[PDB]
Design an enzyme around this catalytic site. Structure first.
Site, mmCIF file in Angstrom:
data_model
loop_
_atom_site.group_PDB
_atom_site.id
_atom_site.type_symbol
_atom_site.label_atom_id
_atom_site.label_comp_id
_atom_site.label_asym_id
_atom_site.label_seq_id
_atom_site.Cartn_x
_atom_site.Cartn_y
_atom_site.Cartn_z
ATOM 1 N N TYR A 281 -9.739 7.832 11.643
ATOM 2 C CA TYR A 281 -9.306 8.160 12.971
ATOM 3 C C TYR A 281 -10.132 9.531 13.726
ATOM 4 C CZ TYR A 281 -5.206 5.645 11.574
ATOM 5 O OH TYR A 281 -4.548 4.542 11.340
ATOM 6 N N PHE B 160 -5.549 5.764 0.140
ATOM 7 C CA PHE B 160 -4.827 4.821 0.095
ATOM 8 C C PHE B 160 -4.808 4.107 -1.591
ATOM 9 C CE2 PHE B 160 -3.580 3.871 4.173
ATOM 10 C CZ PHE B 160 -4.451 4.410 5.083
ATOM 11 N N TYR C 78 0.940 -1.182 0.100
ATOM 12 C CA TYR C 78 -0.051 0.079 0.181
ATOM 13 C C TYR C 78 0.922 1.276 -0.182
ATOM 14 C CZ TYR C 78 0.905 0.942 4.975
ATOM 15 O OH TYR C 78 1.728 1.263 6.057
ATOM 16 N N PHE D 182 2.638 10.950 3.931
ATOM 17 C CA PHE D 182 2.663 9.832 3.034
ATOM 18 C C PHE D 182 3.383 8.670 3.881
ATOM 19 C CE2 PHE D 182 2.607 11.921 -0.959
ATOM 20 C CZ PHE D 182 2.833 13.442 -0.761
ATOM 21 N N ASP D 183 2.983 7.444 3.498
ATOM 22 C CA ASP D 183 3.622 6.291 4.260
ATOM 23 C C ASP D 183 3.254 4.860 3.155
ATOM 24 O OD1 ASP D 183 4.101 4.074 6.130
ATOM 25 O OD2 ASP D 183 1.889 3.934 6.381
ATOM 26 N N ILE E 135 -7.810 0.529 10.347
ATOM 27 C CA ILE E 135 -9.207 1.337 10.470
ATOM 28 C C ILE E 135 -10.152 0.689 9.715
ATOM 29 C CG2 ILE E 135 -7.991 3.514 10.754
ATOM 30 C CD1 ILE E 135 -8.089 3.810 7.521
HETATM 31 C C1 LIG Z 1 -1.975 5.963 13.152
HETATM 32 O O1 LIG Z 1 -0.838 5.030 13.250
HETATM 33 C C2 LIG Z 1 -0.438 4.488 11.843
HETATM 34 C C3 LIG Z 1 -0.919 4.763 10.590
HETATM 35 C C4 LIG Z 1 -0.376 4.359 9.682
HETATM 36 C C5 LIG Z 1 0.747 3.716 9.601
HETATM 37 C C6 LIG Z 1 1.411 3.446 10.753
HETATM 38 C C7 LIG Z 1 0.708 3.891 11.884
HETATM 39 O O2 LIG Z 1 1.163 3.553 13.300
HETATM 40 C C8 LIG Z 1 2.277 4.259 13.707
HETATM 41 O O3 LIG Z 1 2.332 2.576 10.949
HETATM 42 C C9 LIG Z 1 2.898 1.485 9.834
HETATM 43 C C10 LIG Z 1 1.762 0.624 9.409
HETATM 44 C C11 LIG Z 1 4.010 1.128 10.556
HETATM 45 C C12 LIG Z 1 3.936 0.602 11.959
HETATM 46 N N1 LIG Z 1 2.889 -0.279 12.478
HETATM 47 C C13 LIG Z 1 1.520 0.095 12.709
HETATM 48 C C14 LIG Z 1 0.787 -0.904 12.750
HETATM 49 N N2 LIG Z 1 1.557 -1.824 12.022
HETATM 50 N N3 LIG Z 1 2.602 -1.498 11.571
HETATM 51 C C15 LIG Z 1 -0.470 -1.410 13.224
HETATM 52 C C16 LIG Z 1 -1.778 -0.060 13.143
HETATM 53 C C17 LIG Z 1 -2.009 0.410 11.723
HETATM 54 C C18 LIG Z 1 -2.982 1.517 11.794
HETATM 55 O O4 LIG Z 1 -2.814 1.773 10.512
HETATM 56 C C19 LIG Z 1 -4.141 1.596 9.812
HETATM 57 O O5 LIG Z 1 -4.981 1.363 10.227
HETATM 58 C C20 LIG Z 1 -3.766 2.201 8.357
HETATM 59 C C21 LIG Z 1 -4.394 1.019 7.418
HETATM 60 C C22 LIG Z 1 -3.158 0.229 7.305
HETATM 61 C C23 LIG Z 1 -1.778 0.976 6.735
HETATM 62 C C24 LIG Z 1 -1.442 1.787 7.830
HETATM 63 N N4 LIG Z 1 -2.691 2.847 7.990
HETATM 64 C C25 LIG Z 1 -2.474 4.152 8.201
HETATM 65 O O6 LIG Z 1 -3.504 4.790 8.663
HETATM 66 C C26 LIG Z 1 -0.968 4.984 8.180
HETATM 67 C C27 LIG Z 1 -1.213 6.155 7.889
HETATM 68 C C28 LIG Z 1 -1.695 6.405 6.421
HETATM 69 C C29 LIG Z 1 -1.548 8.019 6.245
HETATM 70 C C30 LIG Z 1 -0.501 8.714 6.408
HETATM 71 C C31 LIG Z 1 0.116 8.505 7.565
HETATM 72 C C32 LIG Z 1 0.208 7.047 7.991
#
Ligand SMILES: COc1cc2cc(c1OC)O[C@H](C)CCn1cc(nn1)CCCCOC(=O)[C@@H]1CCCCN1C(=O)[C@H]2C1CCCCC1
Length: 128
Positions: free
Chosen positions: A101, A118, A45, A55-56, A75
């Site tokens: 969020y 995304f 992704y 961005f991520d 989410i």
């Molecule tokens: C709000 O916190 C974050 C948001 C998002 C990424 C985050 C994150 O954590 C600090 O870290 C990366 C995925 C790496 C670390 N990690 C975290 C988790 N597994 N690996 C588990 C929790 C994931 C929560 O993220 C999500 O639910 C979504 C969907 C899956 C991919 C990441 N997602 C995000 O919301 C990113 C976010 C997207 C927009 C730009 C900033 C980062």
């Protein structure tokens, strides 16, 4: 750009039909099966705040992102959206804060009331 294109042309995949999760299929996948609650899902992704400000990508960490579907490890919008995808599919999602969020946000990465974008590629999924 791509967020605006989802606003204009995306499908509303919410049950409530509140435009909270909008989807465009960018590359068609294969198979009759889509993931269901419980499956271990493998994706790549690219995600960002819809205003381009942060961005991520999974590619930043040189590994697929792995989660269990429908378990709230991600989410809401991902549990809803990935459940619609076929193996090999690339999709764009545009997501209102209620399916991400919310008013609290998740600082420092996510402000209050953020819309998210995304691009997701579904690599594989496996049953519990
Ligand atoms: C709000 O916190 C974050 C948001 C998002 C990424 C985050 C994150 O954590 C600090 O870290 C990366 C995925 C790496 C670390 N990690 C975290 C988790 N597994 N690996 C588990 C929790 C994931 C929560 O993220 C999500 O639910 C979504 C969907 C899956 C991919 C990441 N997602 C995000 O919301 C990113 C976010 C997207 C927009 C730009 C900033 C980062």
């Amino acid at each position: 750009g791509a967020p605006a294109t989802v606003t204009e042309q995306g499908e509303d995949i919410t049950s409530k039909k509140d435009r909270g999760v909008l989807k465009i299929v960018k590359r068609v996948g294969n198979g009759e099966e889509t993931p269901m609650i419980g499956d271990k899902v493998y994706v790549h992704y690219k995600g960002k705040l819809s205003n381009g400000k942060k961005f991520d990508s999974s590619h930043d960490r040189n590994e697929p992102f792995v989660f269990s579907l429908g378990k709230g490890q991600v989410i809401k919008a991902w549990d809803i959206g990935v459940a619609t995808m076929k193996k090999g599919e690339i999709a764009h999602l545009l997501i209102k804060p209620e399916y991400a969020y919310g008013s609290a946000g998740s600082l420092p990465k996510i402000p209050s009331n953020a819309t998210l974008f995304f691009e997701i590629e579904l690599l594989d999924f496996k049953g519990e």
